[PDB]
Nucleic acid binder design. Structure first.
Length: 105
DNA sequence: ACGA
């Protein structure tokens, strides 16, 4: 929605995310899936430099993407992972949505 | 400090 929420929902400083601890947060509310990006804010923010507002951009570089996937109700997950390019939605040169991976929508 |  916004840059602050994007960082909380999609950035991680660790590869081993504690899915069951984080996903129960109102931020995630035990949703089906959430993908994190292993990167510091500055590197991710740079991807939106020069990008038109409310449009998507695909990174040239790859990132490691820890992913929490709901396995058992109501809030139990399995940690998965993959590496790929990321597609972000930009607004005022700041990421506001994690649009897709490997390619933009 | 072993972490795609």
């Amino acid at each position: 929605q916004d840059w602050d929420t994007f960082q909380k929902k999609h950035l991680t400083d660790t590869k081993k995310v504690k899915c069951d601890v984080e996903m129960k947060k109102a931020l995630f509310d035990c949703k089906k899936t959430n993908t994190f990006i292993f990167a510091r804010p500055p590197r991710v923010q740079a991807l939106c430099k020069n990008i038109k507002n409310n449009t998507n951009v695909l990174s040239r570089d790859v990132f490691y993407l820890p992913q929490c996937n709901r396995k058992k109700l109501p809030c139990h997950y399995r940690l998965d992972g993959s590496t790929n390019t990321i597609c972000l939605t930009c607004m005022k040169e700041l990421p506001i949505h994690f649009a897709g991976v490997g390619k933009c929508p």
